Design a protein around this ligand. Sequence first.
Ligand code: HEM
Ligand SMILES: Cc1cc(N)nc(-c2cc(CNCCF)cc(F)c2F)c1
Ligand SMILES: C[C@H](O)[C@H](O)[C@H]1CNc2nc(N)[nH]c(=O)c2N1
Ligand SMILES: [Zn+2]
Length: 411
Amino acid sequence: RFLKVKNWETDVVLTDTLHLKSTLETGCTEHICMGSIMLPSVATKDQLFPLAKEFLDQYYSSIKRFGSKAHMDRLEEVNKEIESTSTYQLKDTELIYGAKHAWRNASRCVGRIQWSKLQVFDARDCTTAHGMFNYICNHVKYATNKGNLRSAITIFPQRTDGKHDFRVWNSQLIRYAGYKQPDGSTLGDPANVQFTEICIQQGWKAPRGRFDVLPLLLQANGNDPELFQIPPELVLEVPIRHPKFDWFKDLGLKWYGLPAVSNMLLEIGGLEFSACPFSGWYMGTEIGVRDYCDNSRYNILEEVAKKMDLDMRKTSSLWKDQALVEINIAVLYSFQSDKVTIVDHHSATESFIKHMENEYRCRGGCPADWVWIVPPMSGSITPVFHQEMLNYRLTPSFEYQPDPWNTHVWK
Ligand code: HEM
Ligand SMILES: Cc1cc(N)nc(-c2cc(CNCCF)cc(F)c2F)c1
Ligand SMILES: C[C@H](O)[C@H](O)[C@H]1CNc2nc(N)[nH]c(=O)c2N1
Ligand SMILES: [Zn+2]
């Protein structure tokens, strides 16, 4: 019941008891495991007080005043507001706690060692898409911090009826555009081609190039979303060069500094925040391996292989592997030489093991998704490969939600 997880590099073992506080479900049964399924599987007032109660109890436990007069009255108070409004409102304190802990509990995040250093921007007074643009802009500018990136989150008004949702329709605040071609192939980011057509559908005038920064599509209080372009001076980009291969610049690649997921759902005390964009800094691989070398993304192994002169006739020459290592030395070097915050897959996976050590110490566990924690290259020469990890769902939590253009009632 109180399980053991081992590291097969270090022979270290840690006992996980935190999984007893697990509430949600995984998709695995006693007879099947789904830990490589990517995305497995209104809210009334009866269900809402249990969730509020459990959240308020761990928050008051947290500040070392478990069950004091404050906790008692704040429970009675929240119950009364759930009778009255069939919902309730978080204190600013409770919002910042819930947000930091949704991160803390994000089992697919390797960077969680920083979970307590998180800047929460309360945008629950927002009422318009224009006010969303403004709140998002100061988030970008603050978290970019002249390349010295800072972790942040901007939390928009919580969901109420369900047809009055605040949604950023973008999947990340800053992404490059996707255009297919007359000949069928694709310029820019093939991941984004449907979205880019939607922005163009709403009148975005496309500069039909490669690294075209998409505009924000912002829906406020359930209304039809509206286009706003982040001022370019606020979008920091890093030009990729190599420390050795001076033909690297001719490749003409570049990436934005700021990873900022905008399409997910934040859950606190059973209250649901449909718009909650959050940013940190990049681990090198997401750019070098996934963005640049996914077959369905930028797909540059083709060219980098050529300009090195590699044996591309044979699959077993590992020309793909060699060209992948060079690409990731260049992303890191480019980011580091401009003092833009970035972490390399060795330094970040080592911190996660350290973070894991602390979590099992002062919390009794650490949800973790091995399928996602292992970097997408050099797997077993990173220590997380060798670390058994228990996955389970704690709350407060970040959750996936459907793309808004499949649900939205539109006119
Ligand atoms: C501080 C620097 C951070 C680093 C280095 C980092 C690193 C990463 C990486 C490499 C991934 C895998 C992304 C992918 O493959 O799609 C990831 C996922 C994730 N990150 Fe972190 N992150 C950071 C900050 C944050 C913050 C501030 C939050 C939220 C408050 C967060 C929440 C998440 C969540 C919920 C996931 C999994 C959900 C998903 O991407 O599908 N991270 N992170
Ligand atoms: C806060 C944060 C830190 C970091 N290092 N990466 C990301 C990050 C996450 C995603 C999407 N994750 C769901 C994929 F469907 C995409 C990106 F392009 C990212 F950059 C986010
Ligand atoms: C099939 C599998 O679930 C899918 O490729 C996952 C594997 N692990 C991943 N890990 C990270 N960090 N990011 C991803 O997109 C994925 N994709
Ligand atoms: Zn499983």
